Structure 1
């Protein structure tokens, strides 16, 4: 098993390409109400999924809901790609604002693995260019995560490592 320690009061930031299995992992490891996803927040703004005009407000709404949860001292997982520094930055600030530990959980899987899961998805899909870009972005992000303010940085380097994860909420 790969034991990843997180404090009871954490902001768990999932980092990974579309198709890297963030939501699947989130559903396996955390309670449904602990998980705030970008899909969910966009859905509050529009029932039209491909509406790129609501993306900003959805980010704002994601940040706000997370802020209020952490404020209440409730462990929260951000289920969004988070492969751009600009997306991670406000989460870190939120975490530090409410004295939570920001934790990065990085799905450092090959692009091919994500591309294939994507094609095999029945719920919703993205175009292949999206995952190519995500994967490059995820990779460029790894080295700097600790410097960004993440107190614990856990890089999962393969499907088997992802599968073997057990969280220990010791602190």
Structure 2
């Protein structure tokens, strides 16, 4: 088993391409209310799943929901791709503002694993170019995560490592 230590009051930032298994992971390890996803926040703005003008407002809504939860001292998991630095930066700022530890959990899986899961999804799919781009962005993000302000950086390098994770909420 791979034991990942997280403080009782953390902002757990999931980082991974579409299809990397973020939401599945979040569901397996955390309570439903602890998880705030970008899909959920987009849904608050538009019942139209494919509306792109909504993304900006949806990020604002996600950041604000996270802020209020953390302000209440409630461990929160951000279930979004988070492969761009510009997406991670305000999350880290939020964590610092409410004196929480930002934790990075990176789904460092090969692009082919993500592409294959995507092809087999029955809930919703993305285009292949999206996952190609996400994976490149994820890879380029890894080295710099600690310096970005993540207090603990956990890189999961394979599906088996992902599957072996157990969180320890000691601190």
Fold conserved between structures, TM > 0.5: yes
**How many angstroms apart in 2 are the aligned matches of 1:154 and 1:32?**
22
How far 1:26 sits from its partner (Å)? Answer: 0.1
**Can you give the 5+ residue segments of structure 2 that lack an aligned partner in the other structure?**
none
How far 1:46 sits from its partner (Å)? Answer: 0.2
How far 1:68 sits from its partner (Å)? Answer: 0.1
Aligned runs of 1:1-171 on 2, under 5 Å? 1-171=1-171
How far 1:40 sits from its partner (Å)? Answer: 0.1
Give CA deviations for 1:82-138 in whole Å, capped at 9, x if unaligned: 000000000000000000000000000000000000000000000000000000000
**How many angstroms apart in 2 are the aligned matches of 1:157 and 1:97?**
31
**How many angstroms apart in 2 are the aligned matches of 1:155 and 1:81?**
15
How far 1:2 sits from its partner (Å)? Answer: 0.2
**Can you give the 5+ residue segments of structure 1 that lack an aligned partner in the other structure?**
none
Runs of 4+ in structure 1 off by over 6 angstroms are none
**How many angstroms apart in 1 are the aligned matches of 2:81 and 2:49?**
16
- Give me the TM-score of the superposition, normalised by structure 2: 1.00
SS in 1 for 2:78: strand
Give CA deviations for 1:7-53 in whole Å, capped at 9, x if unaligned: 00000000000000000000000000000000000000000011000
**How many angstroms apart in 1 are the aligned matches of 2:18 and 2:167?**
23
Give CA deviations for 1:59-84 in whole Å, capped at 9, x if unaligned: 00000000000000000000000000
**How many angstroms apart in 2 are the aligned matches of 1:52 and 1:137?**
20
The count of aligned residue pairs is: 171
- Give me the TM-score of the superposition, normalised by structure 1: 1.00
